[PDB]
From Swiss-Prot, chain A:
Top-rank taxon: Viruses
Name under which the protein is recorded: Spike protein S1
Region ranges (Integrin-binding motif): 3-5
Subunit structure: Binds to host ACE2. RBD also interacts with the N-linked glycan on 'Asn-90' of ACE2. Cleavage of S generates a polybasic C-terminal sequence on S1 that binds to host Neuropilin-1 (NRP1) and Neuropilin-2 (NRP2) receptors. Interacts with host integrin alpha-5/beta-1 (ITGA5:ITGB1) and with ACE2 in complex with integrin alpha-5/beta-1 (ITGA5:ITGB1). May interact via cytoplasmic c-terminus with M protein. May interact (via N-terminus) with host bilirubin and biliverdin, thereby preventing antibody binding to the SARS-CoV-2 spike NTD via an allosteric mechanism.
Portion of the parent chain present: 401 to 449 of 1273
UniProtKB/Swiss-Prot annotation, chain B:
Effect of L34F: In strain: Omicron/BA.1
Top-rank lineage group of the source organism: Viruses
Coiled-coil regions, chain positions: 2-46
Name this protein carries in UniProt: Spike protein S2'
Impact reported for N22K: In strain: Omicron/BA.1, Omicron/BA.2, Omicron/BA.2.12.1, Omicron/BA.2.75, Omicron/BA.4, Omicron/BA.5, Omicron/BQ.1.1, Omicron/XBB.1.5, Omicron/EG.5.1
Known function: Subunit of the fusion protein that is processed upon entry into the host cell. Mediates fusion of the virion and cellular membranes by functioning as a class I viral fusion protein. Contains a viral fusion peptide that is unmasked after S2 cleavage. This cleavage can occur at the cell membrane by host TMPRSS2 or during endocytosis by host CSTL. In either case, this triggers an extensive and irreversible conformational change that leads to fusion of the viral envelope with the cellular cytoplasmic membrane, releasing viral genomic RNA into the host cell cytoplasm.
Interval of the full protein contained in this chain: 948 to 996 of 1273
């Protein structure tokens, strides 16, 4: 689960709290990233 | 005989002087470009050189 604010960081060669301390993707990643709003299910 | 020495020295001098050319890189110094540019695009810059 991530927040739309900085949700775009899940991508090769990105910087930020998520990409630098939580989940970092390699530069030559091959595959697809999928996301969807989950307000109805998830909304500390 | 002097022309052989002159031509070899000149070709060699041109070969070393080519290291000052940027070829479109932000800068011709590999360490300078690598020290301030993130790898995913420093690769693009260094490839030209």
């Amino acid at each position: 689960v991530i927040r739309g604010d900085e949700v775009r960081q899940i991508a090769p060669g990105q910087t930020g709290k998520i990409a630098d301390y939580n989940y970092k993707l390699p530069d030559d990643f091959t595959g697809c990233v999928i996301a969807w709003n989950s307000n109805n299910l998830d909304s500390y | 005989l002097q022309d052989v020495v002159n031509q070899n020295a000149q070709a060699l001098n041109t070969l070393v002087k080519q290291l000052s050319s940027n070829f479109g890189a932000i800068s011709s110094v590999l360490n300078d470009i690598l020290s301030r540019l993130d790898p995913p695009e420093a690769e693009v810059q260094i490839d030209r050189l």
